[PDB]
Amino acid sequence: NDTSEVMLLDTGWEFSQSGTEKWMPATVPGTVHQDLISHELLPNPFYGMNEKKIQWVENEDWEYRTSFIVSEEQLNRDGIQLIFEGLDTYADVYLNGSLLLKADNMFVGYTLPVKSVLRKGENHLYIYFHSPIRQTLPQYASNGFNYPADNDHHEKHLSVFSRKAPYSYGWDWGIRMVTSGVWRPVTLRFYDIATISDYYVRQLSLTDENARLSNELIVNQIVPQKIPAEVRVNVSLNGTTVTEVKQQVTLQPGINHITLPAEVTNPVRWMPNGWGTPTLYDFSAQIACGRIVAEQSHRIGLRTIRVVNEKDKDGESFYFEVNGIPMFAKGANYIPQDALLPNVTTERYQTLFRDMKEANMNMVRIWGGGTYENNLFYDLADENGILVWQDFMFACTPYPSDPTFLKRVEAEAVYNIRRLRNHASLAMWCGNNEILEALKYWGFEKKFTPEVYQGLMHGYDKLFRELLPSTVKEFDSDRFYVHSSPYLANWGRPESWGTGDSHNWGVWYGKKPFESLDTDLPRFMSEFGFQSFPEMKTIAAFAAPEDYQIESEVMNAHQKSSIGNSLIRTYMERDYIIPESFEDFVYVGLVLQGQGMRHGLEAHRRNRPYCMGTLYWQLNDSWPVVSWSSIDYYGNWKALHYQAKRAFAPVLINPIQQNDSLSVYLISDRLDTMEQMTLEMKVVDFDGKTLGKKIQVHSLEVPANTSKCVYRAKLDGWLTPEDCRRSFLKLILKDKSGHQVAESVHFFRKTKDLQLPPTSVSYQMKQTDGKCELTLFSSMLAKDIFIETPLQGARYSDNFFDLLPGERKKVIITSPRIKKGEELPVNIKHIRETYK
Numbered sequence: 001n002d003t004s005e006v007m008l009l010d011t012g013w014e015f016s017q018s019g020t021e022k023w024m025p026a027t028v029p030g031t032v033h034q035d036l037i038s039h040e041l042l043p044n045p046f047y048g049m050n051e052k053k054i055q056w057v058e059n060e061d062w063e064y065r066t067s068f069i070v071s072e073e074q075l076n077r078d079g080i081q082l083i084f085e086g087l088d089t090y091a092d093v094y095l096n097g098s099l100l101l102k103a104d105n106m107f108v109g110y111t112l113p114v115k116s117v118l119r120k121g122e123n124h125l126y127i128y129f130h131s132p133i134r135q136t137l138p139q140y141a142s143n144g145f146n147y148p149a150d151n152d153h154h155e156k157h158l159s160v161f162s163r164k165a166p167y168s169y170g171w172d173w174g175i176r177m178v179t180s181g182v183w184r185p186v187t188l189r190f191y192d193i194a195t196i197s198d199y200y201v202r203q204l205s206l207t208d209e210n211a212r213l214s215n216e217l218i219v220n221q222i223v224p225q226k227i228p229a230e231v232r233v234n235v236s237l238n239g240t241t242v243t244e245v246k247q248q249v250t251l252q253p254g255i256n257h258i259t260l261p262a263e264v265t266n267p268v269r270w271m272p273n274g275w276g277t278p279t280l281y282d283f284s285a286q287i288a289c290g291r292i293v294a295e296q297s298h299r300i301g302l303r304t305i306r307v308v309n310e311k312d313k314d315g316e317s318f319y320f321e322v323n324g325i326p327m328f329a330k331g332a333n334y335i336p337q338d339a340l341l342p343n344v345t346t347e348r349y350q351t352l353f354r355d356m357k358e359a360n361m362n363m364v365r366i367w368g369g370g371t372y373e374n375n376l377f378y379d380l381a382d383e384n385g386i387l388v389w390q391d392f393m394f395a396c397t398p399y400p401s402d403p404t405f406l407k408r409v410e411a412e413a414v415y416n417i418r419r420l421r422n423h424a425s426l427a428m429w430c431g432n433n434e435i436l437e438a439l440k441y442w443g444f445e446k447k448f449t450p451e452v453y454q455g456l457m458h459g460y461d462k463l464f465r466e467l468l469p470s471t472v473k474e475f476d477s478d479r480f481y482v483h484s485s486p487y488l489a490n491w492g493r494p495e496s497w498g499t500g501d502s503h504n505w506g507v508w509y510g511k512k513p514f515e516s517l518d519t520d521l522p523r524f525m526s527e528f529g530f531q532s533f534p535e536m537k538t539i540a541a542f543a544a545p546e547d548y549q550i551e552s553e554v555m556n557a558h559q560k561s562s563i564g565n566s567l568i569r570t571y572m573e574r575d576y577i578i579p580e581s582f583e584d585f586v587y588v589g590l591v592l593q594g595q596g597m598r599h600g601l602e603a604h605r606r607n608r609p610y611c612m613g614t615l616y617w618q619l620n621d622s623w624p625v626v627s628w629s630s631i632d633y634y635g636n637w638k639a640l641h642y643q644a645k646r647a648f649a650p651v652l653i654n655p656i657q658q659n660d661s662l663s664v665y666l667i668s669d670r671l672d673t674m675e676q677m678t679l680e681m682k683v684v685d686f687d688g689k690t691l692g693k694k695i696q697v698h699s700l701e702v703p704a705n706t707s708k709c710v711y712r713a714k715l716d717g718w719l720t721p722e723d724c725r726r727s728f729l730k731l732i733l734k735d736k737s738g739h740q741v742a743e744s745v746h747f748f749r750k751t752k753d754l755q756l757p758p759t760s761v762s763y764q765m766k767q768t769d770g771k772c773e774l775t776l777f778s779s780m781l782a783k784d785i786f787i788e789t790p791l792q793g794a795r796y797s798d799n800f801f802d803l804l805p806g807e808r809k810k811v812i813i814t815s816p817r818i819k820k821g822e823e824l825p826v827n828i829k830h831i832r833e834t835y836k
């Protein structure tokens with residue numbers, strides 16, 4: 001790219017519990033905890049009861065060191081920077097007897113000039129990590145009150161004082177692992193003349209005819225003299241130059257600001273998943289001095305995103321318009337993928353994006369108790385067409401608002417805005433998760449003096465209604481900012497539901513039936529959710545078979561919701577027969593979570609345009625645990641993930657039965673209108689036998705981006721109460737020529753009320769390396785089948801589906817660990833097997 005040399009400081013690291021003078025080898029980027037685990041100086045933190053056994057670690061201070069060689073030629077480079085991409089969190093950095101930095105913010109990268117401090121030969125870098133606990137005890141003692149951060153699992157709520165991942169202190173799906181370390185990469189760059197400190201591609205306008213861009217560079221020149229240079233930007237697509245521009249300058253010592261306009265005639269637009277291809281241009285900036293001294297590139301998607309948050313007859317809208325088109329959001333809330341962030345590999349990031357894309361998602365919310373994600377996460381979002389909703393890292397509690405605290409926050413906002421603002425995927429910023437709801441509704445006015453309450457409320461505006469929005473206005477001025485999610489709507493106050501986004505915790509916390517999701521509608525569902533135990537092979541990762549009970553000591557470690565296990569059973573009983581075995585209860589809870597949550601995702605699409613988005617709580621897990629996730633910590637799709645895929649299909653046939661009547665909707669998020677369509681339905685008993693005749697509705701159109709009712713029939717005079725216990729509605733949609741575009745199955749009763757016949761799902765298997773093809777068959781309906789394998793992370797073409805009477809079904813299972821002639825264990829469960 002340029003004449004610079006980059007040296008990665010990622011080997012030869014050692015660490016030491018401070019005070020012990022004992023050093024061991026370490027892995028950087030990494031965490032104190034992993035370094036310990038690696039030397040069997042800690043038990044597996046995720047196993048059994050080990051959570052209390054690992055806590056002493058947050059009480060110690062930790063030291064890291066490494067050495068490296070610098071040559072005489074390297075020392076003669078004009079400039080040399082040490083970059084820390086992340087230090088978790090209070091870290092005194094020493095190089096060659098010099099204090100370079102007293103770091104205090106996990107979310108900020110630090111760029112340090114070090115040429116004057118480096119030595120020909122060996123060079124020594126020592127980092128001292130103060131315990132974030134010990135560091136902040138004096139700060140808490142001075143405070144004279146404990147902030148109400150309930151997810152901070154300690155008597156003293158020290159999380160609020162530290163710019164450090166909130167979930168690291170614990171969360172209602174998480175293990176408390178208050179860790180430290182060089183958590184992102186350390187690099188040394190030897191260079192001449194200058195570096196590009198920032199390259200921002202600012203889009204000025206975009207139409208079908210022309211994109212106009214402004215390339216804004218910040219160049220830090222490190223030499224004393226004036227340096228003539230030419231600044232060049234190359235725009236290319238798939239390896240071919242689309243435009244080139246250049247500018248003559250003379251660079252002065254210190255910072256230089258350079259602006260180059262550029263246009264792309266007839267731009268190829270970036271579109272979200274479902275609406276086209278996520279086209280990314282390559283924008284390359286270079287500083288040329290008679291030598292390319294510095295270069296920086298971004299991949300750039302040309303699109304418009306506008307969040308429309310406007311007064312209207314229903315209250316206040318909250319939706320996304322993408323390239324001019326209202327786009328119904330389909331997605332989920334994302335949390336950190338591990339208790340130990342640097343453990344998450346490229347592959348795990350890649351598979352997670354495959355999981356979102358395969359489930360037809362077009363949006364992910366990076367919720368405010370995690371981190372601002374790494375550059376890879378956003379690159380993946382860009383290339384998968386996944387819009388990103390970015391919370392700032394504040395969740396559930398009020399925070400300090402003193403000048404020093406606000407200076408630290410300003411630093412991280414400026415850092416991460418500039419870091420992330422070139423991503424096509426980045427759709428909006430949100431100041432916090434639920435802090436205004438908390439201050440309004442969670443009873444603080446009874447827990448604090450009126451004086452401290454008032455300081456909390458003034459402290460809110462300082463940060464969320466002034467500092468954060470001004471910073472966005474300055475550094476990302478065409479991106480939407482909202483102070484909090486949910487901004488106004490509260491789940492207990494129906495009057496508020498037509499105003500902005502909702503977190504509807506009526507289901508789950510409010511104990512409301514899944515059917516409440518059909519009546520209790522938001523403008524945009526930014527959270528709603530339901531727990532499940534993960535499958536058996538995940539339980540066996542943390543629990544020995546002795547412990548396989550809901551309420552074992554090992555189980556209950558792994559349940560961070562203290563009302564959780566009881567709600568699951570309560571809800572199961574409403575809709576399913578509760579199984580006697582632990583294994584079968586786990587199976588039915590997967591089915592339960594999946595069926596209830598998809599009924600909600602359907603209600604939200606069905607009720608477009610009133611509702612314009614749904615993001616379920618939650619996508620993923622940071623460790624082996626019972627949670628609201630649709631994908632467990634090992635990558636295994638729960639029922640919910642297959643059900644989200646189906647509920648989010650571009651065209652969906654949605655039968656909805658209420659008041660002893662059936663309605664059928666056709667729901668499209670396609671950009672084209674379908675014409676001359678035929679919906680066809682027939683009632684089929686559980687042995688395979690059609691009941692009555694096929695029902696036809698011809699001449700249907702399905703306009704782009706609409707939900708419409710095309711069929712209603714009362715159940716009375718159609719099916720007896722007995723038929724409803726014994727049959728199902730099969731539904732297909734086809735074009736004029738009879739080509740199937742969609743299908744659905746509908747049951748008229750709750751599963752516990754169905755007369756399921758006893759039955760055997762048989763299968764043939766054809767197994768090769770990396771692959772099994774299974775062919776399944778049952779003469780009678782088999783309800784909600786679970787094809788279970790002991791192979792962690794095995795992927796399925798389908799699972800958690802109804803095997804219909806006498807209808808063969810192909811299922812492909814893939815995994816790098818599938819060996820030809822080591823026959824894959826397969827256990828097939830279905831509802832009827834679960835009770836006798």
Ligand SMILES: NCC/N=C1\N[C@H](CO)[C@@H](O)[C@H](O)[C@@H]1O
Pocket residue numbers: 171172173395396433434503505527617628
């Ligand atoms: N305040 C409870 C509702 N909100 C949420 N539910 C999740 C599960 O309770 C929790 O992990 C997040 O904080 C989220 O914002």
Ligand SMILES: [Br-]
Pocket residue numbers: 078079080081113114115116222
């Ligand atoms: Br320097």
Ligand SMILES: [Br-]
Pocket residue numbers: 130
């Ligand atoms: Br200190």
Ligand SMILES: [Br-]
Pocket residue numbers: 081111112113220
């Ligand atoms: Br520098």
Ligand SMILES: [Br-]
Pocket residue numbers: 255256257258
């Ligand atoms: Br300048």
Ligand SMILES: [Br-]
Pocket residue numbers: 464465466469482483
């Ligand atoms: Br605001």
Ligand SMILES: [Br-]
Pocket residue numbers: 657658659660661
């Ligand atoms: Br009904």
Ligand SMILES: [Cl-]
Pocket residue numbers: 309310311316
């Ligand atoms: Cl408004």
Ligand SMILES: [Cl-]
Pocket residue numbers: 316317318319523524609610611612
């Ligand atoms: Cl809306």
Ligand SMILES: [Cl-]
Pocket residue numbers: 184185374375
């Ligand atoms: Cl990274």
Ligand SMILES: [Cl-]
Pocket residue numbers: 144145447448449452
């Ligand atoms: Cl108080």
Ligand SMILES: [Cl-]
Pocket residue numbers: 451455
């Ligand atoms: Cl006061």
Ligand SMILES: [Cl-]
Pocket residue numbers: 606656
């Ligand atoms: Cl409806």
Ligand SMILES: [Cl-]
Pocket residue numbers: 633634
């Ligand atoms: Cl894993």
Ligand SMILES: [Cl-]
Pocket residue numbers: 655656657658
């Ligand atoms: Cl229904």
